[PDB]
């Protein structure tokens, strides 16, 4: 199937309390594999999945060098952006960055992306053509003119549709047993009366991977969105995910309600009924 590699960077300023907190994490699909924590003793990019551990000293040196460089870029940007928004030296502020690439089941490039945020709000984003930028406000338009002038898009594109893909393809193979799997949802239904008039039906999806999934309820074929209670997909902690959707139904009419489950690991969508 298709796959992605994504890196996430968070820098949080700590006025009076030293350098900004910097945390980087890397994912292949929904599996994390590396981290860097500016507050940790090692000051090294660290492995976070068994299959990345086999990378040699040159790899960890390279990632450590480069992840530090990223932190220093972002640290300086915190000052710049504070100035752009005319904010005080006293308050804490956050820069978040996400970038990555997707490949098809043939290992070929599908698309690339990068988005930057300030204080949890869009700042600047690379467009789908990987040649142009979208600035969210007047401050970001300054950054945009700067990056257009410096041909930043071309450099990032060379990474997104080049080296990003090559590494992703390598990771996909070294981590094959973990990454090229699809664990279908183990599904079941629960049922509990709430009164003489109504009962709760909860449709469960457990132990699935990747996290992408869809649970929908229907009534005599009609979409029940939403007298439906639907929780966020959540990590089980063992590399799989969980999710449930529930409806409150008229006492004795459970037979009309169907839960529909869609997931990459299922040859056909499932239908559950009480």
């Amino acid at each position: 199937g298709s796959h992605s590699m994504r890196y996430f960077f968070t820098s949080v300023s700590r006025p009076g309390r030293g350098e900004p907190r910097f945390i980087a994490v890397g994912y292949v699909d929904d599996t994390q594999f590396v981290r860097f924590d500016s507050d940790a003793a090692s000051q090294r990019m660290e492995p976070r999945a068994p299959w990345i551990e086999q990378e040699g000293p040159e790899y960890w040196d390279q990632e450590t060098r480069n992840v530090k460089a990223q932190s220093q870029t972002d640290r300086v940007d915190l000052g710049t952006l504070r100035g752009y928004y005319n904010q005080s030296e006293a308050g804490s502020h956050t820069i978040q960055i996400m970038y990555g690439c997707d490949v098809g089941s043939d290992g070929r490039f599908l698309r690339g992306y990068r988005q930057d945020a300030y204080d949890g709000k869009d700042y600047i984003a690379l467009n789908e053509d990987l040649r142009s930028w979208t600035a969210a406000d007047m401050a970001a338009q300054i950054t945009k003119r700067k990056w257009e002038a410096a041909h930043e898009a071309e450099q990032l594109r060379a990474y997104l549709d080049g080296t990003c893909v090559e590494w992703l393809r390598r990771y996909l193979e070294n981590g094959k047993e973990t990454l090229q799997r699809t664990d279908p949802p183990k599904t079941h239904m629960t049922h509990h009366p709430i009164s003489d008039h109504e009962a709760t039906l909860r449709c469960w999806a457990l132990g699935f991977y990747p996290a992408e999934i869809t649970l929908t309820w229907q009534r005599d074929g009609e979409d029940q969105t939403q007298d439906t209670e639907l929780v966020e997909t959540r990590p089980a902690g063992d590399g799989t995910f969980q999710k449930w959707a529930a409806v409150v139904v008229p006492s004795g009419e459970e037979q009309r309600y169907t839960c529909h489950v869609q997931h990459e690991g299922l040859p056909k969508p499932l239908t559950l009924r009480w």
Partner: peptide, 9 residues
């Protein structure tokens, strides 16, 4: 592997 050429805003 991460992007090797971060550029300031």
């Amino acid at each position: 592997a991460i992007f090797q050429s971060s550029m300031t805003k």
